[PDB]
Amino acid sequence: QYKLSVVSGGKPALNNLSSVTGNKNIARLSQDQRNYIIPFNNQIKVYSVETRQCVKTLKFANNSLLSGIFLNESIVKILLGDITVAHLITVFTNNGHVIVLNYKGKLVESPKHFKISLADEKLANVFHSEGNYRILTTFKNSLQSYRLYALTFDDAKKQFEVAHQAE
Amino acid sequence: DSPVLQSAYDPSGQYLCYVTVALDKQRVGVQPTQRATSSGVDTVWNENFLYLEDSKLKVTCLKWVNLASSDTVAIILGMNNGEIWLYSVLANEVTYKFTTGNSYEIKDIDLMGNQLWCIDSSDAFYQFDLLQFKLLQHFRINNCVQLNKLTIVPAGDSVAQLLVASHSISLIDIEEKKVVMTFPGHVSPVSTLQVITNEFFISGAEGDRFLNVYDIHSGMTKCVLVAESDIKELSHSGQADSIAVTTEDGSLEIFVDPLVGNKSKKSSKKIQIVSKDGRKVPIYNAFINKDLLNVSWLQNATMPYFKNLQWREIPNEYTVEISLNWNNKNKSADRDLHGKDLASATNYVE
Amino acid sequence: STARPRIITSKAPLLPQQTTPEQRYWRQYTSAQLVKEHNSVTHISFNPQHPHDFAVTSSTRVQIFSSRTRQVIKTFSRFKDVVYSASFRSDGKLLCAGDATGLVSVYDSYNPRTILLSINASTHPTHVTKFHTQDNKILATASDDRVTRLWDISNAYEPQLELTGATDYVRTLSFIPAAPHLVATGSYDGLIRLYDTRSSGSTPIYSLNHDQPVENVIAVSPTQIVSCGGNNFKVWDLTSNKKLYERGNFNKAVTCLDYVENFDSPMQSALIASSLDGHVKVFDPLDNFQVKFGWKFSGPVLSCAVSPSTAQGNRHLVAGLSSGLLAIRTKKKKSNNFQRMMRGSEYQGDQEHIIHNDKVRSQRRMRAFERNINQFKWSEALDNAFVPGMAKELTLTVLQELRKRGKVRVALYGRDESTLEPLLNWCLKGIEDVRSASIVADWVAVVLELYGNTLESSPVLQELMIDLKTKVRHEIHKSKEAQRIEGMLQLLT
Amino acid sequence: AVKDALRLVHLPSCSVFSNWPTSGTPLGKVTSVAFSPSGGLLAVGNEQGKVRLWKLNHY
Amino acid sequence: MSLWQLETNSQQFLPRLNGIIIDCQVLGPQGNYYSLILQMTENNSNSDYQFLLLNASDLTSKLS
Amino acid sequence: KDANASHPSHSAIQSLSFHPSKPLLLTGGYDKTLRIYHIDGKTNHLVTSLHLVGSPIQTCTFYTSLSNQNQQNIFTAGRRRYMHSWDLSQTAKIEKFSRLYGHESTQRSFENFKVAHLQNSQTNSVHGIVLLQGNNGWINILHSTSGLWLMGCKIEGVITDFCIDYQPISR
Amino acid sequence: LYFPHISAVQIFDFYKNEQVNYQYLTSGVNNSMGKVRFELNLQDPIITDLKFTKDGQWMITYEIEYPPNDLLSSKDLTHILKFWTKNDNETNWNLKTKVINPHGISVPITKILPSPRSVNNSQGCLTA
Amino acid sequence: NYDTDFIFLDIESTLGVVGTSNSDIFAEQLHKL
RNA sequence: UGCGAAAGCAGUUGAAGACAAGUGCUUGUCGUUCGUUAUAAAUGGCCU
């Protein structure tokens, strides 16, 4: 007769890492600057800046991959477009899962899931300028140490390779 | 009175080409009539325009090339230089220009497949081929002192006779190059010369409220259709099933079964557009296919808007209501009624 | 970002006898003028029409006072004996008056020289003369003959109708609104008698018993009539023929009574009733005829009147005293080249597609103490609290705000005896009030704990604590005493 | 300051045109002037609130 | 929120924000928007974050 | 045919401006209304109007970003300590510039202003700037979008008028 | 859905999953200034209870105001009870009445129960 | 809730509920431009 | 810190390591650990 179901959302997600300052905000503004993507603890909400209304919501429960992945992990960054390749986004989680999702449409049940190979490293941040990608990772005085890799996608193997640059 | 100098739906009735003046230069633009595409994608404004780089240069005639017939959709534009421009709307450029030897302006044009006929202000006929891009033949028929209108009778898959009118209407045989029959036309110059069916073509003149339905084979006036005001445009549905005429006062008159007291018939249904505040919005063109009617009006200054309505169910006297800006209090989504920011918290006041 | 909240003025819990919206309206009848007449002013009446002048009857003369000027503009002295009324007609063109001789004189209002009509109603005195409100042509007269004749202006030789049946003096006459045929008379028999002019008349349809001599009968509404006699006024319903309410808060015999409706007051309707004890009091018919205001005068009040509903100007409250005094209380109500150059300011965008408004409404100017608090001037905000001519409640707020902000020691550091005395002077007075007693204790506690050393070396401060000690001890006795009356009061219950 | 006080100057000759404006040209108290980026249209506003439009045929 | 103008060392202010500013950032090719994170430290039981996007032109909340 | 003939104005035409590319004409005046007409020479109908309550218009002008051609905007100003910008039909997107970032004393009205293009050479980016007239010789230069105060220019005596000239350097 | 945040009430729409309003329901240093250093030890009035009448036209709120430290009146809490209204179209609640120290001085209101529709048309409440 | 369903709040601030053709080619192309 | 009413009733606030300064010794500190229920102070105040 009765059934239990989650309805509303939760707190906005944040980069809950003490050392990083000025990089706490993970929300991104689209390239055309017409909508803002904010990750929550249980979804990703796309708000339209002009009308100030949530045009789209991507719930992790609705998707099977997101339900398995996030439902502990958290999004470490969102990058506009798709690295592998006009409304695509690439989500990097702390463990290393890379997920290509789409807003402005209907969410696909089989996104382009990938996985960066990290050896006892917690992904902390990623960034790019023009096609070039670097990833910062945390490894272990109560003070963490950081390592900086170069991330590239090889089309032949369809995998993300990481090459050490700094520490 | 209307910024749109000329307008013309495509044969399918899904896109409208209109010519307007920007400063001192005419620009030609195509807009989609339907609110949404068959795929369900919402229709959007088309900013691309074809500018005539010369102020003197003007468009005198516009004719669509049937979208289904040809791979690329084209609109054929007659100009006052005496040359015809074939315009591919997608490339937004004039692919080819048919030039007559003379410089007289083109009064009318018509098309049947590859055939293309026009008339100059010198009263000279010309024949052209779209596939071959050549001027086949040109001639002048005697007793055709003026020629404002040209229409080709749809007989089979070839052209055998042409309808022409200046103030009276004439039927001419191409091979014989002579008049066959003459119909007593209007006092004023003829403005519309469409052919409704076989042996029945309608005729209308400038500043006239009467349309004459003539029998091609006999030559007698079958009926005279009357509008409440001067007629500007005309659209015929099916095979004489319905006729819609855009009056000069901005109304639309529909004639239901005009070909079935009997001599003179009046329009059966009248359609108007009036805004919520009270201003009347004139209609400058319309299209009627089987059971739906497309009405076009101008908002802002030159922006065309469209509405699709099923004229069968509409009552006899019907006024479309449209929301146009008038004394709109300007609401910003980032502010409330009192101008306070939405993010701001409400203060405590006892 | 949000606009800064305004500092909220301190408001303690309500005390008894707060000002009411009805009182705040009637206090505005401020300007008081006392005029002295030769004899008691018996009747007062207001012209129904603009400018709404009012006529006072006193001794052998009738005077009309200007509403705006509040002075006599016309005088009717043609009467030889005492005059007993000055009512106007509904049109306001005529005013009728009665005499002790029994003669009824109708003059043109604002033309004392002309007499339009003179009627000998009876040989006995004619105390009441009133025009019929619905019908202008018919004039009513009541005399000591105990017959209330109904006259016609056209036929002045015989009355139209002679209502009788009263066994004592008839000094009151009323016309029921919406019932032109009905006429009400009140005699010193204590009976209010209703007559129908449509019928034969001369016999009342019914009589209502007031049990005391009736001094005035007034019709407040089409179905209710209020009659004042003896020491109380009672309101009767004609449909039920029984008294709905009775109010006897007066001490002497109520004399005159007037009713005003649909005027700009909070109360839709008002009933003013003179007392003969010096009191004229306002009652509201919408709240069961409960008292809402009052005035007191030097002597017994024989007549009262208030400006009509449509006064269209300054309102008036008039009271008439047997000493001959008349009391009036009033509620008062470039170049063409340049303009063509600057011409668009009047336009409000009535013909435009879009109207956009972003001007913020002008907020009330903030006071000095509020500006200092906003700018974090704790010490200067304290100084502004104790300045000459500062509202006591407004001084209490800044003290509470600084306490609320947690800035009580911070406001008291850079101070000596010279700049501490203003705070102690107010504390000497603020300790008495119940509202500011607790706040004074907090501030006086800190200053003692923060300036103990300065106290010893400064003599003038010392006396400020001797006398402050005296007063707080006095407040202790009052607070102990209030507990004792509390204890005994619990015993009674 | 005054009515009809508008002059067009040819460059680089720096000679004021003679034929236009004339005594009958309506300009009024000229308070705004604008040239179209292309097409040679001239718009003149005046204190009366009337924007009058001219076309230069050369352009 | 204080915008320090480093040329003259001046400063412009946006006060009475809903919470203390954890993070600031200038978001745009021309700095059209400012993105802020607010904390609302009154609630000790939880960390209540609020993301505010202000229009730099008139410092009004474009999206909270 | 007169531009204003379709929808007349209730004041003097204080400023006129042609759109850089589209065939639009903009009008303004102390009637506090911004009327845009579609100039064709024969009809000149009114595209849209915008009444700004309590905002007399002493100068108004179109502005199009030199890089992003799609960005169209209208700046209007009067004897007021603020300025309005209208980005370019159910509603109008209006922003008010009213902040001078510590230089309010030098600028008591926005009534005399002009818009130009500034190239940030250290990044080669181009953006608009709003130039204003100050109290004593001061010219205050603001960012057209963000409204930030960029630089100020000072001359001796009373500033009467100013203009802008562009000098190309290389490609 | 109404959340009694400290000294303020959040109105949150769970159907749309967005906040609709944030209103301050108490006096105090709420948004007058940003507290720093020792001012950060101050406690704003705490909204302890918040209830609606069955009709929904009236809001009943109960608040505790805490005195600042280092004063004589530094141990006497103040208990305030407030009644607010709003029309359905409006969004902001308007304080209509305020009761200072209900039930006595320094005595809390532990329970609030709005009255049923039968009695006074839900225009009443009980406090315990 | 005053309907049949019940709402509950979870300390992650999650509120759950317990309760009972040439033209067609042209139309695409014109939209792209 | 625990319990309770708000009043109050009981009970805590330890050790190691590293660093700085002064003179192996003294003091003060900790973006160091283990265990127990367990004054402040860089002239530095809120727009239009």
mmCIF file of C-alpha atoms in Angstrom, chain D residues 2-50:
data_model
loop_
_atom_site.group_PDB
_atom_site.id
_atom_site.type_symbol
_atom_site.label_atom_id
_atom_site.label_comp_id
_atom_site.label_asym_id
_atom_site.label_seq_id
_atom_site.Cartn_x
_atom_site.Cartn_y
_atom_site.Cartn_z
ATOM 1 C CA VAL D 2 17.419 80.202 -33.248
ATOM 2 C CA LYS D 3 15.241 78.570 -35.899
ATOM 3 C CA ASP D 4 16.517 77.156 -39.192
ATOM 4 C CA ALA D 5 20.147 77.457 -38.017
ATOM 5 C CA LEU D 6 21.541 74.398 -39.775
ATOM 6 C CA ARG D 7 24.280 74.453 -42.409
ATOM 7 C CA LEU D 8 25.975 71.699 -44.390
ATOM 8 C CA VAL D 9 29.649 72.220 -45.247
ATOM 9 C CA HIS D 10 31.427 70.446 -48.085
ATOM 10 C CA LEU D 11 34.848 68.987 -47.308
ATOM 11 C CA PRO D 12 37.713 69.610 -48.170
ATOM 12 C CA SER D 13 36.409 72.706 -49.972
ATOM 13 C CA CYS D 14 34.893 74.055 -46.725
ATOM 14 C CA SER D 15 32.170 75.845 -48.704
ATOM 15 C CA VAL D 16 28.656 76.081 -47.299
ATOM 16 C CA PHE D 17 25.996 74.662 -49.597
ATOM 17 C CA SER D 18 23.773 77.368 -51.088
ATOM 18 C CA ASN D 19 20.667 75.593 -52.376
ATOM 19 C CA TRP D 20 19.712 73.826 -49.127
ATOM 20 C CA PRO D 21 18.329 74.625 -46.543
ATOM 21 C CA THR D 22 16.007 77.293 -47.955
ATOM 22 C CA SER D 23 13.679 79.763 -46.277
ATOM 23 C CA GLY D 24 10.852 77.249 -46.675
ATOM 24 C CA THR D 25 12.753 74.266 -45.293
ATOM 25 C CA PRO D 26 11.110 73.260 -41.984
ATOM 26 C CA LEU D 27 13.777 72.784 -39.312
ATOM 27 C CA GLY D 28 12.661 74.818 -36.320
ATOM 28 C CA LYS D 29 14.860 74.958 -33.234
ATOM 29 C CA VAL D 30 17.307 72.258 -34.285
ATOM 30 C CA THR D 31 18.391 70.298 -31.218
ATOM 31 C CA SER D 32 19.435 66.876 -32.577
ATOM 32 C CA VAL D 33 21.166 65.736 -35.765
ATOM 33 C CA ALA D 34 22.118 62.293 -37.034
ATOM 34 C CA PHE D 35 23.578 60.770 -40.195
ATOM 35 C CA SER D 36 22.772 57.201 -41.161
ATOM 36 C CA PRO D 37 25.808 54.875 -41.285
ATOM 37 C CA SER D 38 24.873 54.099 -44.886
ATOM 38 C CA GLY D 39 22.281 55.311 -47.351
ATOM 39 C CA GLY D 40 22.823 59.032 -46.854
ATOM 40 C CA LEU D 41 19.827 59.750 -44.638
ATOM 41 C CA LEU D 42 19.829 62.888 -42.493
ATOM 42 C CA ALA D 43 17.586 63.104 -39.424
ATOM 43 C CA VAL D 44 16.961 66.439 -37.697
ATOM 44 C CA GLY D 45 15.077 66.793 -34.438
ATOM 45 C CA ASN D 46 13.675 70.064 -33.156
ATOM 46 C CA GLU D 47 12.125 71.521 -30.022
ATOM 47 C CA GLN D 48 8.645 70.752 -31.352
ATOM 48 C CA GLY D 49 9.352 67.030 -31.075
ATOM 49 C CA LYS D 50 9.364 66.441 -34.830
#
